[PDB]
Symmetry: C3
Subunit: 322 residues, 3 copies
Amino acid sequence: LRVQFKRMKAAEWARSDVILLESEIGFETDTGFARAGDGHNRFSDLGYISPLDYNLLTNKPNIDGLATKVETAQKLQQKADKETVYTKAESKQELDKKLNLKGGVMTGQLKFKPATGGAVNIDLSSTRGAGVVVYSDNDTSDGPLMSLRTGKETFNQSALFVDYKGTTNAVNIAMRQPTTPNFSSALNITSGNENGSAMQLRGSEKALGTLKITHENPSIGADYDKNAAALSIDIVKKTNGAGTAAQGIYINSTSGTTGKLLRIRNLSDDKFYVKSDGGFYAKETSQIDGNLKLKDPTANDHAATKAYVDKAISELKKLILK
Amino acid sequence: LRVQFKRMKAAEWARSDVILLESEIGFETDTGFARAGDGHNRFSDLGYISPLDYNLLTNKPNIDGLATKVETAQKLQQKADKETVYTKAESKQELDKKLNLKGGVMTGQLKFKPATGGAVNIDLSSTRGAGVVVYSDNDTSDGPLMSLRTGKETFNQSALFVDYKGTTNAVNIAMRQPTTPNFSSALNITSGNENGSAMQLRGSEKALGTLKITHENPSIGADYDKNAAALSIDIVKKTNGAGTAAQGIYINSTSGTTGKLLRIRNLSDDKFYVKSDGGFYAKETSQIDGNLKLKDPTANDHAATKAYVDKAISELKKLILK
Amino acid sequence: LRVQFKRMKAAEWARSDVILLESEIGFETDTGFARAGDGHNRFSDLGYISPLDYNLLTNKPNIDGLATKVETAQKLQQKADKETVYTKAESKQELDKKLNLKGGVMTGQLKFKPATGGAVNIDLSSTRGAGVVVYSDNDTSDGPLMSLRTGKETFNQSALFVDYKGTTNAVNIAMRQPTTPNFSSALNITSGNENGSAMQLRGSEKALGTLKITHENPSIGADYDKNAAALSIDIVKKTNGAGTAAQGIYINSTSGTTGKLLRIRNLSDDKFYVKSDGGFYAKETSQIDGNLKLKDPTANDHAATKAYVDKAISELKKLILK
Ligand code: NA
Ligand code: NA
Ligand code: NA
Ligand code: NA
Ligand code: NA
Ligand code: NA
C-alpha cells in the first residue's frame, strides 16, 4: 500500500462540504498540511494534526528574563533627566564664583543694606592679627582709603567712636617725612557749628600736660626754623564781614587753681610767669612803649610813682625853706 | 480507501497498553493530534508527528533584540536617582543665596572670628576708588557708623593706626554747618590715664606752627563773637576733691631756643612778646594793681625805684644844707 | 488495516531518491516526524505535515509588551549618570562652605583687589545699627584693630575722611581710666613734613573756644597735680643739630581783632591780660629782675622814669639856690 488521502488546495477545502470520518486524514496540496476528521466538522473547522500551542514547544526563549516596556518605564521614571540637573563640572563652575567662608578675594563691590552689632563685626579677642587693613601704593586716586559720612542734622551718633583700654596710643597718626616737603597736615579739622567747640580735649594727668606739643627743628641749622612755632593762632573775620572781636587765648580755672597760670621757661629755667593771683615775673630787662599805672612804692626796690616823687620833692622844698 | 486509525481520547491513550507499529498512526479524538508508533513505546511515550521545537519555527520574533531584566537593571544602576540630586532650578535657588566674588548685596551681618594682614584686607594700589565707605542719611540711630573697642589694660596695639605719605591731609574731619547751631564738636577726646598726655603732637615745620588754630567769626557782625577764643583752657578739681594745683600753659625749650617764647600780634604788628631770655615788650600803656619790684635805673628811660628817689632827695638835702 | 508508511532515518531520507506520491506520507524513524509527498520533490524538500510558523501559534507571549535594547538605550541616553552629578548631600556639603547673603561667619581673610563707591559700601540710612564694629578683648596682639596706609608721596586723597552732620561729636575717642596708670595717650600725631602744620584746626564758635582743653585733677588731693598743665609745649633741636630758633606760642589776627589777645583768669576773675593793642594788666604785685624802659609819667599813678626824677631834682636845686 502507498496510501493517498482526500486532498485539494487549502482554499478549496475551506469551501468544501466534504466531511472527513473520525481520524480520516485530508491534505492541503499547496501547504503540505494535514487535518484529521471528527466525523462531523467541515475541513476549515478541523485542527491541524500536531500541536500549535506555544506552551508545548521545547527550546522556548527565556521570556520571563526579558524586561517589559512598562517595568522599564516605571524604573526610568525614578531617574534624573540629564537636561534638568547640573554636571559636577557645571556645579564646580558655579561654586567657584561664590565666596568661601574660609576666605577669598573679592573683585567687585561688597554692599551692605541691613535688612554685638555692626553690618560688619570683627572680633579679634582670640587672635593676634589686625582687624581692617586698607592700603594703597597707587600714585594717585579719586577717593580716600576710608570715608564716613552722615547726612541729617538730627543724627545722634558719632561717625567714629574709639573706646580704648591699653598700654599704647588709642589712635596714632604718622605723616611720614616726604622726599620733598609739601603743604599737607597729619590732621585737619574744620567746623562751621557756632554753638560747639570744633575740638574738645579733657585729661587728668598727674604731672604732664593734657595736650603736649613738641616742635622739632627739621634741620641741623641753628636758625633754620626761626619762623616756626609750636602753636600758631589766627583770629579772622567772616568773608565780607565787618570784623571780629574774638579773643586769642583764654585761660580760667572755674574751681580755683594754686598753680601758675602761664609759665614760660627756656633750658628748664623760669623766664616769665603769671602766678595764680595774676602777679607776673620776668627774668630780664623789659620795655613798655607807654606809661605804667601802678601803686605807690613801699619797699626800696619798688618802682616809684610820679606822686611819690612829687611829694618827696615838695617835702624837701618845705623843709629847706623853713 | 478512506483510512481510519486506532483512536481514543488523549487520557485513554495515556493509560493504554496498545503498542503502535513502527510508523503506524494513532489519533487523539478530543485533541485532533496524531502520534506515530516506534514498534515498542506506549502512546504517551511517543512524540507528535510534527516538530514542536521553537528553534525550528519560521517567523520567529527578534528575541535577541529585546532587553533583559538583568542588563536593564545593570544600566539603570549607573543612572542618578531623581530623589538624590538637585534640579537646576533647585541648584539656582541655593546658589542665588550665596555671595559672588564679583560683588553683591549683604542683607545680614558679616561676622569675622579669625581661625599683609587684616581679617579684612583692601588693596587699592591698582584702582582709583575708595576702600571702605560708610554712610547714613538716617534721621537718628542707636549706633555709630564705626566703632573700635579694646577691653584689656595690657592691650599693646592701637585701635587705629594711620601711616600716611601723600600731598593732602592724612585725616580730615569736617563738621558741616548745621541748619541751626548745636552743642557738638568735630573731635572730642577724653582720657582718665594719669601717667600719659591725653594728646600728643609733634611736628617739624620750617615756618609754620606745629598746631595751627584759626577762629573765624560765624557772623558778618564785627562783635558777634566777642565771647569766642581760638583756645580756651579750664583747670578743674575732681568731683568731691579739695582743689587743684595744675598749671594753665607751660612752655619750655629743653635744648634752648633763640626764638621768642610768646609773641602776640594784631594786624601782623608785634603787640606784646616774651623774648627767649624772659624780658618782655608791651606796645601800649599798661597797669599793675600792685607794686613792681625791679632794678635801680641806669638809663634815662628806666623806671626809677624808691631807693633811687630817696637817695637823690638825701644827696640834694646834704648838698643844700652844706 | 494497520497502515505503515515508507520510512527510514531522517539522514537516510535526505539522501534518498524516493519520490512520495501527492499526499503519501513518509516517516522519519529516529525523529517521529512525517512529511507528505507532492508527487515530485525528494523528501528533504518536503515540508512537515503540520505548521511550524510562529505566527500561527496559540498562547503566544506578549512580545509587543517587551522592551527592545534599542528603545531602552535611547531612553537611558536622556538620564544623568551617577558619576557626573553631585548628590544632594554633596551639594549641601559644598554650599555650606560658601557665604550667605543673609549673613555668616568668616573664619579666614576677606581680601579685596578691585577689578556710591568703596570696595566695601555700607548704607545705614534705613537702619539703627552700627556700620563697622571692631573689638578685641585679647590681652595683647601683633596688629592694630584698624590700619590705613598710603605709600606714594604723590598720593592725593586722605586716609580717613569724616564728613559729618549731626547733634553729637563727629569723632569721639575715650581712653578709659586704667586699673593702674600708664604712659599712653588717646591721640598721638607725628609729622616730618616741614612745609605743612602737623595739625590744623578751624572753627567758627560764637562764644566758645575753637579748641577747648580741660585738665581735671585725677585726685581729691588739692596739690596732687602740682606738676600738671592743660597745655605743655617743648621746642627742641634735631638730633645732632646745632640748636633751634622756633617760637613757643605765636598769636596774630590777620584781619584785626578788638578782643583781648591773651586773657588769664582764676575763679572767673581777670588776673592778667594783654589787650588788643598790646597793653597789659596784672592784678597783683609783680617783679622784673632787670630794668623797665618806659615813658615819662603824666598821671600821678604812673611809674616815674630816671629822667623825670633827675629833672625834678635839678629844678628844685636851681629854685633853692636862687
Ligand atoms: Na602756687
Ligand atoms: Na633749672
Ligand atoms: Na632771638
Ligand atoms: Na607789620
Ligand atoms: Na576790646
Ligand atoms: Na568774676
